[PDB]
């Protein structure tokens, strides 16, 4: 038994030819009452991987420290390979996964959804999924919370599968991400205007652009709904 | 089940999927979900499959009464008020998740209505379990007061978002266009994605491969003279 | 489901079914309700599948550590009462068990014990355990006599499972016949219950409710 | 759901949101909560969306008939019809309706009906579940009979805080004004006050 | 127990080329006890065939319920009822006891006498039309039946080719089903001639 | 109390029933209507005549639609037609549009309305 | 409330040949009514011409891939380059399964490979323990839809010889690696139209002592 | 439940009932009837809830006899079974559940043929050559299969039945202290004091 | 199925135990023991729920024997019931309650006078002239005060025991398939086939 | 209950209300919620009385041992002891804690800790049951880095609004001014705040 206390929701993500774009809302929901705003959940680990988490802030924060300590372990010894060949997204994914698996054994879970996404040092894009259940899959677009059935369908138009990735680029991806974040703000009660957009590109690395706003939202058809009387 | 309703300047366009489920088991590959209160007042339904069609049929009867009784064309409003009123009495135990659409002398319409008589008006509304998938696509391309033809391309593709990602939507995409002061045209099977491929070997069997315990002859004839 | 063993003059005949269902769906028809504890002892599979099969594989481990340690072949009483105290340790751990251990020794004779999940062990000469133990019982115990021949004993094992298969839902599939001797059990093979039906309808003249 | 109504010098200005969440899926977000149940007595809805709409038709029906046989009802009168329905359905429905109306004898008046069904005549009222977050702001910053401009921005600013803390409140801010001048619908786009 | 898992039952039906076929099993149980290897779950008024699945009591209860209503139609209007008109009838009737309902799955099959077309239709307990011109399967191994019937089926079948696909599909689901099997009977329904032929199968 | 539960239609001594003959007198002092059955349709036809010169007659439907495929027309009294056209429409919906969701046979429909007529010669009121 | 188990669906089919074996399954992974992935085998090679799928819940079903692949390694180490047999593989798994039975696994597990005589061997496990050999076994959320057809084309269930009319039963007919391709595709074609956990992709893995051959076929999108 | 057996022999019908009566956990009686003669050529036995059954059986014995004196000649066994089926269908829908599990054996003298029927409390009519209700059914439905042939006589049926009695006595945990045996045939309805 | 009986007379103890076993819905054995000798002239009869009876009887057989052979003194029936009572009391508090009621009848050698103890499944011993457990013993109690005297021989208490068993056939809703009688006499422990 | 803490230009002021209820019955009306766990870094209790008090001793116990070995803590450190203890006893115990302190380096700071064991720094924090009501007033009337006189009357007015709408709050208004200068205790009696 666990009860969700303070929860956060919605991270979206998609691949493109040279890298990934993962983006998230920032807002701490506490149910219908909203107690925190601008709560970051794009946690950068290394300098070419963002681990994008949703669900409980408490569980997120306790494994936020452990994620920084893996990098600390990697830098213990191996001066030639303290991130170069000791850090890739696939390692960071597995580390997270078996901690949630062992807590589902306990019955005392880490209540979260987790995206680990980045680009490997093989040079190939990475996008995998884990949660409090401790299921695991790879994907070509991926999402969490309310966007795992809202935003994610919009992105499946864009990239159908794992051979539509080179038909997708970063300008076409950028737009798709913008659109998706706007859409989440309309139909979810738990998504706000702030969102931070991180692109992990292989030619320019982790470019993390922070505090983007929703723009070109329509609310001008609102007057043409009338009363019932 | 992905069932959308997109309003446009000239009328309202209502589309539905033809995959019918019962559990994770597909009941029917192809069976349309569109019903008819009146010619100009169509609706489709998701939720309990028996409770949409009975509700539609019954309020179908009572507007048909009225339509003789006023000696004129009925209205979208008349269907909504009787629907809404009916469903409250039972307290939402007769399930119904209908996009109700139609045009009438008093302009273009497009409603959604839930089991206990909660009612919304929008410009694009969707209900069922595929409703989310549709809605994402539907909030991007749209703008106030579409064209006819734009509205038709966007509504089909909202169901297609459905077909791709909601497992309750599959197969054929039917469309029905209603436009003010003109006939309603049902463009069944507008978009048909996925068709079951030919068997690698056709399955035929020689006779006597199924063995008979006994034989008897019982015809469907009634009794008549010698 | 139905598993029976009856002592007679040549030893013990074990006859069991093989349709082991999941509920309204028949998971498999091929599931063998014989569990070879070693060459000289047999266990039926009744109760939960998993639990009953598993620990009688571990009983064979305890069979081979009897053989080694005592330099003798295990008593039936010894085998049975091992498995018994083990399931008492797990009593209210929710695991289910019902097996007839069949063995024939030169220092105890042919002996059946029906060991059960509760830590109950009963010595006995006939048991029938399962969903459809009642149906199989009726045929078997009417025509039961201690003096009996091997042919007659074999044919009565077939016919009893056949009756269970007819009326109860979870029985059927296939039969497996063993004839326990003191040199060990002799396998008398697998017969399908659906071919067995139509032989027995002709030969006895029975199954007169079936239209034919 | 956020609903308030506040009286001013020439009448009464009502103000509500336009988001309706059920759970975490927003059913409609351009939702019109401002409902005509007479000709000068409009209501604001909160609680369960169906149950309130059910009641307001039933009221619209009683009040329309009362106008033609007995004469115009008051704000008071309208509260007696919503009150007695909520009152015989308090164990089985729960409705928060705020009844505001413009008399021609005693200016605008505001009545609140909670979930058990009672009249309380008040110089402003606040109710709902997203505007249960602005209780302390509303009490403090109220001034007796403001000018018309001041009232609108007062109500807007309040519903802005209410929107800010509640994900169940939101969309445009819809406002209906009940006055001798007529019935005038105002609308505030989201950007125009989430900028502040 | 469940009212719908207490005596099993499946009805299969398929369409062919100028013919229909309906077929059922013969197993009538009260829970796990088999009572009889004989019981039709198929009935006929004129050239329309009603297979009714589910609950023991409700097979009889709905059967004389439609016995009454079929009478009224024939005596007034002096014709035997059509497959399509029967399907509508059944839809409305099932719906009458909405709460605490009829505990059955009827399956409607005929060949029209006004145009000479195959018609099939399906229903749940509450009842909703499940139109096809493929096959309608219902019951407890309805799930099993849906896969198996598809694998076999080809649009348009010669009346004794038709007979090969349905016999096989029904027997195989029914000998993996706990509450159903024990013999099977297939009707091949031609415009003017029905043969009722039993199948030898596993009675176990 | 009520006591008007005795019949207003009763037998005459030298046979027949007097009350239904009196009603038919209203038909042979009524307006005139006719019907020719073709092998490809039926035409039914009637006369309109005004109550005032400032009256309309396209506001009156002497031929009325019961269902898309079956129409009706009267001779006799107006008032009596107004109420009966509605009862026929209502019974065509309760009994074939809730039960078979289609339009009824014409033989059957005629029967059903004749029942309404028959039970209107029965009991008081 | 926290619920410690779920599902992820999928449908698998393991067929034993007469000198080959085929363990196949769909590559669609789902949770409820979201398609998680269109592409994702659970049909992993494990070494030593054994292919495993623990299908159903994905969290458990990855636990048994882990521990089993640990056992492959440690068998070679602790039995000094003695290869893990089909028989050996079956019983080891049983032990892993049985090992959590009071907090049981919720997958339907299958292995496949060839036996030592050079014929197929398919063992199939219930969720908590025991196994029995098969010749056809479907599992997954659409098990009971593909299973009764595979019995009518492999084992000739409820079929008789033509013109005998049930006097002579229909005997087995030795199968071809091609032939079994036709069976598997025609079944999962039916499966896509008649169940909703089926589509996107199918991957057949064919196993012999002559190699492991992969084949990816696309399916229908719903 | 109780012992309640049918065997339809090829010249008569033979029913059998439990003598015993147990209320709470104590036997009160051991010679008390559990069947009542409905019509002169129809017998009905009953078992279930053990207070419901007996009262309702009198409800059926009254209703079927009322029509038998009306037409001055009884209702045939098919017609009786049909009537019981109808009632029990209403009765499990009803607020007050009725559980009566009944075997109607009757010699149909209107086609000169024996008939036996098993109507469970759901209300399902079934024609059968031998029947049973409750747990007795579990041991006898097979046992009667082995030795029944279509040729049967009254004295062959008793001797097989006394075999079924004994088998149930060993195997079924409850006591019932033997059966009572009644025959329904073309010459009327008689009892046998051989148990 | 649950019937263990005790009649202590003035030279012996008379114990009876059920011969029937029922696990599940059926009788598995009609001929059985539910009683095990502990010492040469100490008999412990046992009954209750399945499988508590089997395991905890042999557990006690062991303990009591370990002592009486080692130190070559046969414990008083007084000492023995006390040991059995200590494990019975212990177990209700602990994780597994042992569901078993025991009549420990033994012949005191240190008092040359029989003793019969009744221990309820909670762990409370009480010495009595005669005793029972279960609901079946409720029937039998009312014969026991009537016919017992403080001058009874083995022969008297065997004839008293016939009435009590015959009472059980009538009044218990279930059988017990007769009883094994064992008479715990000064000479040894003997089994007789009287009922 | 209503507590709050707010940063300002020259430090941080912690504010609380010393009503402590059990049920309808107010158990004691002079039970402080302002708890010293470090001499310049104090904390604010809310939720169940027992649970927070008990944890506050544990956290005090390890900052005595911290200050004696490692020297003076920072506000960050006091809060992080709390955080990590309420994570390991979150399906067992419930807390509202606002931890606020004056450090020389970083001036006044406000952290708040829900019961799941999340820490979040904010410029202003509010907790209790009356926190919801005054939420709208707090962000409307707060100024970023205002003088001492404006901070005293802001927390006074905010807590006057809490006590008006939350009846589990009242007793008195107490405050701790943690500033560069030191610790100056305030109390404001009911007749003073009632007016203001």
| B120–D31 CB contact, under 8 Å | yes
Q: Which of J84, J116, J132 faces A6 most closely, judged by CB atoms?
A: J116
Query: In chain J, which residues have their Cβ closer than 8 Å to the Cβ of A58?
Result: 87, 90, 114, 116-118
Helix crossing, E56-77 with E83-96: angle to 10°?
A: 130
Residue B120 sits at the vertex; the CA angle it makes with B118 and B122, to the nearest 5 degrees, is 170
Taking CB atoms and an 8 Å limit, are H145 and C166 in contact across chains? yes
Q: Is B89 on the interface with C (CB under 8 A)?
A: no
Interface of D with B in 133-192 (CB under 8 A): none
Closest E-chain CA to G150: E148
Q: Check CB contact of C211 with chain B, cutoff 8 Å.
A: yes
Q: Which residues of H140-172 are buried (b: 16+ CB within 10 A; e: fewer)?
A: bbbbbbbbbeeebeeebbbebbebbbebbbebb
What is the enclosing helix (H) or strand (E) of A69? helix A57-75
Residues 29-88 of C with CB under 8 A from G: 30-32, 49-51, 53-54
- Asked if D174 and D15 touch (Cβ cutoff 8 Å), the reply is yes
In the DSSP assignment, the letter for residue H183 is E
| Pairing of the two strands D2-7 and D12-16 | antiparallel
Contacts of F116 (CB under 8 A, 6+ apart): F84, F87, F88, F91
Q: Which residues have CB under 8 Å from D131's CB, separation 6+?
A: D1, D2, D3, D4, D158, D159, D162, D166, D169
Please give the Cα distance from J155 to J168 (Å, whole number): 18
Phi, psi of E105, rounded to the nearest 5 degrees? -130, 85
How many angstroms separate the CA of residue A181 from the nearest CA in chain B? Answer: 10
Whether G and C touch, i.e. at least 3 CB pairs below 8 A, reads as yes
Check residue H10 and give left, alpha or beta (phi > 0: left; psi -120 to 50: alpha). alpha
Q: What CATH number did the domain enclosing E54 receive? A: 3.60.20.10
CB pairs under 8 A between A and B: 47
For residues D176 and D44, give the distance between their C-alpha atoms in angstroms, rounded to a whole number. 10
Residue carrying structure tokens 């786009």:
D189
Q: Name chain C contacts of H138, Cβ cutoff 8 Å.
A: 134-135
Asked if A150 and B136 come within 8 Å (Cβ–Cβ), the reply is: yes
Q: How far apart are CA A153 and CA A149, in angstroms?
A: 6
Q: Does C163 touch chain H (CB under 8 A)?
A: yes
Query: What sign results for the dihedral spanned by CA atoms J77, J78, J81, J82?
Result: negative
Question: Can you state the percent helix, strand and coil of chain J, rounding each to 5?
Answer: 35, 35, 30
Residues 6+ positions from E95 with CB-CB distance below 8 Å: B50, B54, E126, E127
DSSP assignment letter at A166: G
Handedness of CA I69, I72, I76, I78 (dihedral sign): negative
Which domain range does residue G109 map to? 1-222
Give me A174's structure tokens: 């950028």
CATH number at residue G38: 3.60.20.10
Taking phi first (over 0 means left), then psi (-120 to 50 degrees means alpha), and beta for anything else, what does residue E114 get? alpha
The residues with which E5 forms a beta bridge, in sequence order, are E2
CA distance linking residue H46 with residue H133, whole number of Å: 9
Let me know: does D46 contact D17? Beta carbons within 8 Å: no
Residue C123: which H helix or E strand, with range?
strand C120-124
CA of B58 vs chain F CAs: smallest distance (Å)? 7
Asked if C14 contacts C190 with a C-beta cutoff of 8 angstroms, the reply is no
Report the gap between the CA of E35 and the closest CA in chain H (Å): 8
Running DSSP on this structure, what letter comes out for residue A59?
A: H
Half-sphere exposure of G196 (CA within 13 A, CB side): 26
| J116 HSE (CA, 13 A, CB side) | 22
And the tokens for I31? Answer: 């001929």
Contact C109, C91 (CB under 8 A): no
Residues 96-155 of E with CB under 8 A from H: 100
Closest to E181 (Cα-Cα) out of E128, E140, E137, E148: E140
Known binding-site positions of C for bortezomib: 49
Within the 156-175 window of chain A, which residues sit less than 8 Å (CB to CB) from chain B?
156-157
I167: number of CA atoms within 13 Å, CB side? 17
Instruction: Please work out, in degrees rounded to the nearest 5, the angle formed at the alpha carbon of residue I136 by the alpha carbons of I134 and I141.
Output: 95
Look at phi and psi of residue E198 and say left if phi exceeds 0, alpha if psi is from -120 to 50, else beta: beta
Please give the DSSP secondary-structure letter assigned to residue F68: T
Strands (E), A120-165: 125-131, 137-138, 141-143
DSSP secondary-structure letter at G1?
-
Question: D12-16 and D173-178: which strand pairing?
Answer: antiparallel
Q: Which residue ranges of C make up the annotated binding site? A: 49
Burial category of I24 from C-beta neighbours within 10 Å (exposed 0-12, middle 13-18, buried 19 and up): middle
Question: Taking CB atoms and an 8 Å cutoff, what residues of chain J touch A36?
Answer: 120, 122
User: Do residues A26 and A196 touch, judged by C-beta distance below 8 A?
Assistant: yes
**Three-class secondary structure of residue A219 per DSSP:** coil
H147: closest chain C residue by CA: C206
Sign of CA pseudo-dihedral C137, C139, C140, C144: positive
By the 8 A CB rule, do D14 and D176 touch? yes
Query: DSSP letters of C5-25?
Result: EEEETTEEEEEE---B--SSB
Contact between H25 and I170 using a beta-carbon 8 Å cutoff: no
Q: How many structural domains are present in chain G?
A: 1
Judged by DSSP in three states, J133 sits in helix
Tell me the C-alpha distance between I113 and I106, whole Å. 9
DSSP D125-194: EEEESSSSSSHHHHHHH--TT--HHHHHHHHHHHHHHHHHHBTTS-SPEEEEEESSS-EEEEEE-THHHH
Quick one: tokens of G153? 């084309």
Give the integer Cα–Cα distance in Å for G11 and G53. 10
d(CA D15, CA D173): 7
**What six digits make up the tokens of I162?**
């016939």
C104 CA: distance to closest CA in chain I (Å): 20
Nearest to A11 by CA among A142, A99, A118, A106: A142
List the structure tokens of I7: 């009649």
Pick the CATH number of C1-212 from 3.40.50.12240, 3.60.20.10, 3.40.50.150, 3.60.21.10: 3.60.20.10
On whether any CB of chain B is under 8 Å from the CB of D49, the answer is yes
Alpha carbon distance E143, B36 (integer Å): 31
d(CA I133, CA I118): 8
Q: Look-up: residue for tokens 């094992």?
A: C157
Please say whether the beta carbons of A48 and A206 come within 8 A. Answer: yes
Contact G110, G125 (CB under 8 A): yes
Q: Give the gap in angstroms from C-alpha E153 to the nearest C-alpha of chain G.
A: 10
The CA-CA-CA angle for residues I70, I71, I74, to 5°, reads 105
Distance (Å, whole) CA C33 – CA C27? 14
Helix, strand, coil share (%) of chain I residues, nearest 5:
35, 35, 35
Which residues are bridge partners to J28 per DSSP?
Answer: J20
Residues found in chain G = 222
The shares of helix, strand and coil residues in chain F, as percent rounded to the nearest 5, are: 30, 15, 55
Q: Which two tokens stand for residue B17?
A: 């999927």
Is C50 in contact with G101 (Cβ distance < 8 A)? yes
Long-range contacts (CB closer than 8 Å, 24 or more residues apart) made by F108-112: F108/E76, F108/E77, F109/F66, F109/F70, F111/E76, F112/F88
Q: Which domains does chain J have, with CATH numbers?
A: 1-196 (3.60.20.10)
- Structure tokens of B1? 């089940």
A154 and B161 within 8 Å at the Cβ level: the answer is yes
Q: Which of residues 5-34 of F touch B (CB under 8 A)?
A: none
CA–CA min distance C204, chain H (Å): 8
Torsion of CA I154, I158, I164, I169, to 10 degrees: 150
From residue D56, alpha-carbon distances to C88, D128, H131, J162 in Å are 67, 17, 64, 34
Q: What residue has token string 């014995």?
A: H61
Does chain J reach chain F with at least 3 CB pairs under 8 Å? no
Compute the residue count for chain D.
Answer: 196
Strand F63-67, strand G120-125: pairing: unpaired
The rounded distance, in Å, linking the Cα atoms of G133 and G115 is 12
CA B29 to chain centre: 14
Q: Measured between CB atoms, does F90 come within 8 Å of chain B?
A: yes
- Tell me the CA distances in angstroms from A120 to A20, A48, A86, B49, D16, one per residue in order: 11, 8, 11, 49, 51
Burial class for J166, CB neighbours closer than 10 Å (0-12, 13-18, 19+): buried
Cβ pair G88, G79 in contact under 8 A: no
Q: What Rg do the C-alpha atoms of chain C give, in angstroms?
A: 17
The token pair at F72 is 């009706």
Chain A residues touching G33 at Cβ < 8 A: 149
The conformation of residue A132, written as its DSSP 8-state character, comes to S
J94, with CB counted inside 10 A (0-12, 13-18, 19+), is: middle
Nearest to G128 among C30, C31, C50 (CB): C50
Give the Cα separation of E103 and E3 in Å (integer).
Answer: 6
CB-closest option in B58, B60, B65 to F89:
B65
Total structural domains within chain E: 1
DSSP string, A82-121: SSTTT--HHHHHHHHHHHHHHHHHHT----EEEEEEEE-S
Any chain E CB within 8 A of the CB of F107? Answer: yes
* Chain C touched by B204 (CB under 8 Å): no
Given CB atoms, is C24 within the 8 Å cutoff of chain B? no
- Residue A100's contacts (CB-CB under 8 Å, 6 or more residues apart) are A109, A110, A112, A114, A130, A131, A132, A134
Q: Beta-carbon neighbour count of residue C90 at 10 Å?
A: 16
8 A C-beta contact, residue G111 and residue G86: yes
Q: Which two tokens stand for residue A9?
A: 């929701």
- Interface residue of A2, A137, A141, A163 to substitute, partner G, most G CBs within 10 Å: A137
Q: Sheet containing H113-119: which strands, arranged edge to edge?
A: H35-39, H42-48, H100-108, H113-119
CA distances from I113 to C78, I76, I125 (A): 38, 11, 18
CB atoms under 10 Å from CB of A210, counted, come to 13
Q: Is J7 left (phi over 0), alpha (psi -120 to 50) or beta?
A: beta
Chain-centre distance of CA J19, in angstroms? 14
Are the beta carbons of A211 and A194 closer than 8 angstroms? Answer: yes
Cα separation, D29 vs I149, whole angstroms:
93
Edge to edge, what strands does the sheet with E10-15 contain?
Answer: B215-216, E194-199, E184-189, E20-25, E10-15, E135-139
Distance between start and end Cα atoms, chain I: 16
Count of other CB atoms within 10 angstroms of residue C27: 22
Cβ distance of A139 and G36 shorter than 8 Å: yes
Main-chain phi, psi angles of G128, to 5 degrees: -120, -20
J164/D132 CB distance under 8 A: no
Token pair 């592409």 in the structure block, residue: G39
Compute, in degrees rounded to 10, the torsion defined by CA atoms A7, A10, A15, A18. -70
Q: Which chain A residues have any C-beta within 8 angstroms of a chain J C-beta? A: 1-3, 5-6, 28, 30, 33, 35-36, 39, 56-58, 61-62, 108
Write out chain E residues lying below 8 Å of H124, CB-based: 28, 30, 56-57, 59-60
Which residue from G114, E200, G155 is spatially nearest to C30, judged by alpha carbons? G155
Chain C hits for E37, Cβ within 8 Å: 209-211
Residue pointed to by tokens 């409609």: D28
Q: Touching J: which chains, 3+ CB pairs < 8 A?
A: A, D
Instruction: Name the token pair of C135.
Output: 């149906």
What domain range is E165 assigned to? 1-204
Q: Which CA distances in Å does J59 have to E118, E164, J40, J42, J67?
A: 81, 80, 15, 12, 12
- Is residue D108 a contact partner of residue D12, using CB atoms and an 8 Å limit? yes
Residue I195 token pair:
């009922």
Considering only CA atoms, which of C193, A72, C135, B51 is closest in space to residue E99?
B51
- In the DSSP assignment, the letter for residue J33 is -
Please tell me which of the candidates B31, B50, B199 has its beta carbon nearest to residue E127.
B50
D172 CB-near residues (< 8 Å, 6+ apart): A219, A222, D17, D18, D30, D187, D188, D189, D190
């Amino acid at each position: 038994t666990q009860q969700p206390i303070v929860t956060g929701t919605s991270v979206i993500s998609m691949k493109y030819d040279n890298g990934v774009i993962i983006a998230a809302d920032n807002l701490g929901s506490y149910g219908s009452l909203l107690r925190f705003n601008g709560v970051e959940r794009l946690i950068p680990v290394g300098d070419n991987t963002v681990v994008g988490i949703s669900g409980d802030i408490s569980d997120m924060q306790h494994i936020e420290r452990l994620l920084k300590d893996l990098v600390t372990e990697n830098a213990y010894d191996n001066p030639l390979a303290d991130a170069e060949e000791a850090l890739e997204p696939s390692y960071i994914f597995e580390y997270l996964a078996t901690v949630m698996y062992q807590r589902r054994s306990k019955m005392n879970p880490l209540w979260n959804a987790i995206i680990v996404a980045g680009v490997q040092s093989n040079g190939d894009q990475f996008l995998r999924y884990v949660n409090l259940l401790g299921v695991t899959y790879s994907s070509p677009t991926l999402a969490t919370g309310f966007g795992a059935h809202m935003a994610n369908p919009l992105l499946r138009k864009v990239v159908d599968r794992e051979s539509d990735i080179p038909k997708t680029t970063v300008q076409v991806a950028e737009e798709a991400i913008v659109n998706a974040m706007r859409v989440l703000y309309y139909r979810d009660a738990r998504s706000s205007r702030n969102f931070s957009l991180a692109i992990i590109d292989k030619n320019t690395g982790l470019t993390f652009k922070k505090n983007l706003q929703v723009e070109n939202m329509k609310w001008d058809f609102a007057k043409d709904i009338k009363g019932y009387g | 089940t992905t069932i959308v309703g997109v309003k446009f300047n000239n009328g309202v366009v209502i589309a539905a999927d033809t995959r019918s489920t019962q559990g994770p088991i597909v009941a029917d590959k192809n069976c349309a979900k569109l019903h008819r209160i009146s010619p100009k007042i169509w609706c489709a339904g998701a939720g309990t499959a028996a409770d949409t069609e009975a509700v539609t049929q019954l309020i179908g009867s009572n507007i048909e009464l009225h339509s003789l009784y006023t000696s004129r064309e009925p209205r979208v409003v008349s269907a909504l008020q009787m629907l809404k009123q009916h469903l409250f009495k039972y307290q939402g135990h007769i399930g119904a998740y209908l996009i109700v659409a139609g045009v009438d002398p008093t302009g273009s319409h497009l409603f959604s209505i839930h089991a206990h008589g909660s009612t919304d008006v929008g410009y694009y509304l969707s209900l069922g379990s595929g409703s989310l998938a549709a809605m994402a696509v539907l909030e991007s391309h749209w703008k106030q007061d579409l064209t006819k033809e734009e509205a038709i391309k966007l509504a089909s593709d909202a169901i297609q978002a459905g077909i791709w990602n909601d497992l309750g939507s599959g197969s054929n995409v039917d469309v029905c266009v209603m436009e003010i002061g003109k006939d309603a045209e049902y463009l069944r099977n507008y978009l048909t994605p996925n068709v079951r491929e030919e068997k690698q070997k056709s399955y035929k069997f020689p006779r006597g491969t199924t063995a008979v315990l006994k034989e008897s002859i019982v015809n469907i004839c009634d009794i008549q003279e010698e | 489901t139905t598993t029976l063993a009856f002592r007679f003059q040549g030893g013990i005949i074990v006859a069991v079914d093989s349709r082991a269902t999941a509920g309204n769906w028949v998971a498999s028809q091929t599931v063998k309700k014989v569990i070879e504890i070693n060459p000289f002892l047999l266990g039926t599979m009744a109760g939960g599948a998993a639990d009953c099969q598993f620990w009688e594989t571990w009983l064979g481990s305890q069979c081979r550590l009897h053989e080694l340690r005592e330099k003798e072949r295990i008593s039936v009483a010894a085998a049975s009462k091992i498995l018994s105290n083990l399931v008492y340790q797990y009593k209210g751990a929710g695991l289910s068990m019902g097996t007839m251990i069949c063995g024939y020794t030169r220092k105890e004779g042919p002996t059946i014990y029906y060991v059960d999940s509760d830590g109950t062990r009963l010595k006995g000469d006939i048991f029938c355990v399962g969903s459809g133990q009642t149906f199989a019982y009726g045929v078997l115990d009417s025509n039961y006599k201690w003096d009996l021949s091997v042919e007659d004993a074999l044919y009565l094992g077939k016919r009893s499972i056949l009756a269970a298969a007819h009326r109860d839902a979870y029985s059927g599939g296939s039969v497996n016949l063993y004839h326990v001797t003191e040199d060990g059990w002799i396998y008398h093979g697998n017969h399908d219950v659906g071919e067995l039906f139509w032989k027995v309808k002709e030969e006895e003249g029975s199954f007169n409710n079936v239209i034919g | 759901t956020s609903i308030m109504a506040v009286t001013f010098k020439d009448g009464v200005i009502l103000g509500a949101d336009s988001r309706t969440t059920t759970g975490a899926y927003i059913a409609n977000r351009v939702t019109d909560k401002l409902t005509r149940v007479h000709d000068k007595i409009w209501c604001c809805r909160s609680g369960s969306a169906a149950d309130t709409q059910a009641i307001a038709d039933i009221v619209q029906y009683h009040l329309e008939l009362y106008t033609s046989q007995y004469g115009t009802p008051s704000t008071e009168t309208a509260a007696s019809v919503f009150k007695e329905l909520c009152y015989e359905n308090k164990d089985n429905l729960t409705a928060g309706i705020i009844v505001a109306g413009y008399d021609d004898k005693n200016k605008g008046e505001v009545y609140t009906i909670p979930l058990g069904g009672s009249v309380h005549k008040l110089p402003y009222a606040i109710a709902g579940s997203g505007s249960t977050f602005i209780y302390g702001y509303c009490d403090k910053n109220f001034r007796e009979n403001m000018s018309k401009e001041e009232t609108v921005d007062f109500i807007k600013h309040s519903l802005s805080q209410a929107i800010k803390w509640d994900g169940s409140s939101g969309g445009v801010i819809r406002m209906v004004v009940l006055t001798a001048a007529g019935v005038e619908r105002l609308i505030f786009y989201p950007d125009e006050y989430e900028q502040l | 127990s469940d009212p719908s898992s207490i005596n099993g039952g499946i009805v299969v039906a398929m369409t062919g080329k100028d013919c229909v076929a309906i077929a059922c099993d013969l197993r009538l149980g009260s829970q796990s006890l088999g009572v009889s290897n004989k019981f039709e779950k198929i009935f006929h008024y004129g050239h329309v065939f009603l297979g009714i699945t589910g609950l023991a009591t409700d097979v009889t209860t709905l059967n004389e319920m439609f016995r009454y209503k079929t009478n009224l139609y024939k005596l007034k209007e002096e014709r035997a009822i059509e497959p399509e008109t029967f399907t509508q009838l059944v839809s409305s009737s099932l719906y009458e006891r909405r709460f605490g309902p009829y505990f059955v799955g009827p399956v409607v099959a005929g060949i029209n006498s006004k145009s000479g077309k195959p018609f099939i239709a399906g229903f749940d307990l509450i009842g909703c039309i499940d139109e096809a011109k493929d096959f309608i399967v219902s019951g407890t191994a309805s799930d099993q039946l849906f896969g198996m019937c598809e694998s076999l089926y080809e649009p348009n079948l010669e009346p004794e080719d038709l007979f090969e696909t349905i016999s096989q599909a029904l027997l195989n689901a029914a000998d993996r089903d706990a509450l159903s099997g024990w013999g099977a009977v297939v009707y091949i329904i031609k415009k003017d001639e029905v043969v009722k032929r039993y199948l030898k199968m596993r009675q176990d | 109390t009520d006591r008007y539960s005795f019949s207003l239609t009763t037998f005459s001594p030298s046979g027949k029933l007097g009350q239904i003959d009196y009603a038919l007198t209203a038909v042979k002092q009524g307006v005139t209507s006719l019907g020719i059955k073709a092998t490809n349709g039926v035409v039914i036809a009637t006369e309109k005549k005004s109550s005032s010169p400032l009256a309309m007659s396209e506001t009156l439907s002497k031929v009325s639609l019961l269902t898309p495929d079956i129409g009706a027309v009267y001779s006799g009294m107006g008032p009596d037609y107004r109420v009966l056209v509605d009862k026929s429409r209502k019974v065509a919906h309760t009994s074939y549009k809730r039960i078979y969701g289609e339009y009824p046979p014409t033989k059957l429909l005629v029967s059903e309305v004749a029942k309404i007529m028959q039970e209107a010669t029965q009991s008081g009121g | 409330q926290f619920n410690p188990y779920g599902d992820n669906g999928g449908t698998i089919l393991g067929i034993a040949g007469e000198d080959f074996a085929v363990l196949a399954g769909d590559t669609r992974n789902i949770t409820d009514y979201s398609i998680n992935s269109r592409y994702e085998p659970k049909v992993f090679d494990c070494g030593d011409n054994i292919v495993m799928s623990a299908n159903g819940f994905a969290a458990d079903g990855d636990a048994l891939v882990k521990r089993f692949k640990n056992s492959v390694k440690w068998y070679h180490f602790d039995h000094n380059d003695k290869k893990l047999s089909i028989n050996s593989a079956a019983r080891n798994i049983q032990h892993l399964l049985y090992g959590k039975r009071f907090f049981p696994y919720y997958v339907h597990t299958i292995i496949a490979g060839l036996d030592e005589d050079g014929k197929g061997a398919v063992y199939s496990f219930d969720p908590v323990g025991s196994y029995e050999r098969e010749q056809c076994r479907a599992g997954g959320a659409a098990a009971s839809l593909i299973m009764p057809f595979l019995d009518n084309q492999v084992n000739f269930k409820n079929q008789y010889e033509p013109g005998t009319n049930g006097k002579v039963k229909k005997p087995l007919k030795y199968l071809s690696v091609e032939e079994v391709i036709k069976l598997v595709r025609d079944s999962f074609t039916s499966a896509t139209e008649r169940h909703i956990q089926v589509g996107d992709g199918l991957e057949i893995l064919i196993v012999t002592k002559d190699g492991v051959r992969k084949e990816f076929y696309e399916l229908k999108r719903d | 439940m109780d012992i309640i057996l049918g065997i339809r022999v090829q010249d008569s019908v033979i029913l059998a009932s439990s003598k015993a009566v147990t209320r709470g956990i104590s036997v009160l009686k051991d010679s008390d009837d559990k069947t009542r003669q409905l019509s002169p050529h129809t017998l009905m036995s009953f078992a279930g809830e053990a207070g419901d059954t007996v009262q309702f059986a009198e409800y059926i014995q009254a209703n079927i006899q009322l029509y038998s004196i009306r037409e001055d000649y009884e209702l045939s066994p098919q017609a009786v079974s049909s009537f019981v089926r109808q009632e029990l269908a209403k009765s499990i829908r009803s607020r007050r559940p009725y559980q009566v599990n009944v075997l109607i054996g009757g010699y149909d003298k209107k086609k000169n043929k024996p008939e036996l029927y098993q109507i469970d409390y759901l209300g399902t009519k079934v024609e059968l050559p031998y029947g049973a209700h409750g747990y007795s059914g579990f041991y006898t439905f097979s046992l009667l299969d082995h030795h029944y042939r279509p040729d049967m006589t009254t004295e062959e049926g008793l001797d097989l039945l006394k075999l079924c009695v004994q088998e149930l006595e060993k195997r079924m945990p409850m006591d019932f202290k033997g059966v009572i045996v009644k025959i329904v045939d073309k010459d009327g309805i008689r009892q046998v004091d051989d148990f």
